Each structure stands twice: as structure tokens, then as C-alpha cells.
Amino acid sequence: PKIKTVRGAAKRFKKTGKGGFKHKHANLRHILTKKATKRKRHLRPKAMVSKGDLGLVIACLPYA
């Protein structure tokens, strides 16, 4: 039997064709941001071949 912390993926979750999860950024966005436009410029998720370790505790099937 194996429950996979549904919140682990209930936030930042997907496996690119290579496998590497595209994590995500955030920091200021939507919490309180006013200052610094470019800073805010956010982008679109990446990884940490340093944390993808744990960031893998989950996984299971090709879901969405």
C-alpha cells in the first residue's frame, strides 16, 4: 500500500519528457509584491538537481 503525499504534488508537480520535474518559483507574486517589476518577472518552473532528490518522494503514474 503506498500513499503519496497528495499535497507534495498538490503544488508544483509534473515530469518533463526527460523526467526532470519542472518545479516552480514564486516568492513575492500574490503575497505582497508591489516593488520591482522585473524582479517579479517570475518566469516558469525549473529544478534543483540538488533537491529533485526529495522532490521525488512522490511521483507515481503519468497523472495530471
Binding site: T5, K11, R12, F13, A26, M48
Partner: protein, 144 residues
């Protein structure tokens, strides 16, 4: 000619011999050539039971949310593997024995995968830029 020297020498089952190397790992224990503590011998993983500075916070950090799509799965038609296998009753509906979609779905698509044949007239909705032409060696139809 049997040798009365007290023996034979035939053939049967005396072994298959092999399957996988490394079929053992000091396991069952580790009581052996030394003071093998186990727990690899620090002092704070005794009965393991520990996974701390846990695997959640500061790395499972903030969120970029997600509606978690509705539209069933609706897997893509299949790897352009029509004809000589979709029954042959060209178009496509489900019970197929070399590229099937599973009946619980609804919509289809096609994608531009591998080969076709030529006989294959696909209504049954949706064409990919390519599959339109890929199945130009055929009858593109499409009822949607």
C-alpha cells in the same frame, strides 16, 4: 556398455545453475567479521523511523496552481496505427488489437506517429496538421 566399476554417467536435472548475480547482501543480519553495529552506527537512526529536517518545507516551497483538467483522458487517437488492426472497419471505435483507446473516453485526435498503410478512411473526429496529409494516402473524411 555399462561399467561394473560401480557407477553410471547419464543426463537429467542436476542443475539449471544460474539466474542473477549478487544474490545475497550480508543480509539476514550482519553478525560477522566484526562489530557491525548496523544503522551504519552514528546514534540517531536506531530503528530508522526517522526522516527529518523533513522532506516537506523550504524545498516544497510556494505554489503555482492548477485546475487538474476535466476532459477525461481522451488519449490521442493512437500512434497513427490505423488499418490492418482497428478491426479494419475503418474509422475507429474502441475494441482494437494493435492501437486501442479504452472505452470510457469521448474525443480522440490523431497525432502524427508511425506509418499507416493506405486503406483507412477516418471520420471519428480530428486531424493533426500532418496526419491530414499522412493519411492523404487514404480518405481523410472526418465526422465530428
Amino acid at each position: 556398455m555399462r561399467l561394473n566399476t560401480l557407477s553410471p554417467a547419464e543426463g537429467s536435472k542436476k542443475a539449471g545453475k544460474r539466474l542473477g548475480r549478487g544474490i545475497g547482501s550480508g543480509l539476514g543480519k550482519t553478525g560477522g567479521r566484526g562489530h557491525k553495529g548496523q544503522k551504519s552506527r552514528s546514534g540517531g537512526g536506531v530503528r530508522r523511523g526517522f526522516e527529518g529536517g523533513q522532506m516537506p518545507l523550504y524545498r516544497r516551497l510556494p505554489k503555482f496552481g492548477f485546475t487538474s483538467r476535466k476532459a477525461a483522458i481522451t488519449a490521442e487517437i493512437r500512434l497513427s496505427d490505423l488499418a490492418k488492426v482497428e478491426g479494419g472497419v475503418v474509422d475507429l471505435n474502441t475494441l482494437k488489437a494493435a492501437n486501442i483507446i479504452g472505452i470510457q473516453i469521448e474525443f480522440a485526435k490523431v497525432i502524427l506517429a508511425g506509418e499507416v498503410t493506405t486503406p483507412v478512411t477516418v471520420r471519428g473526429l480530428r486531424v493533426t496538421k500532418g496526419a491530414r496529409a499522412a493519411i492523404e494516402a487514404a480518405g481523410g473524411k472526418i465526422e465530428e
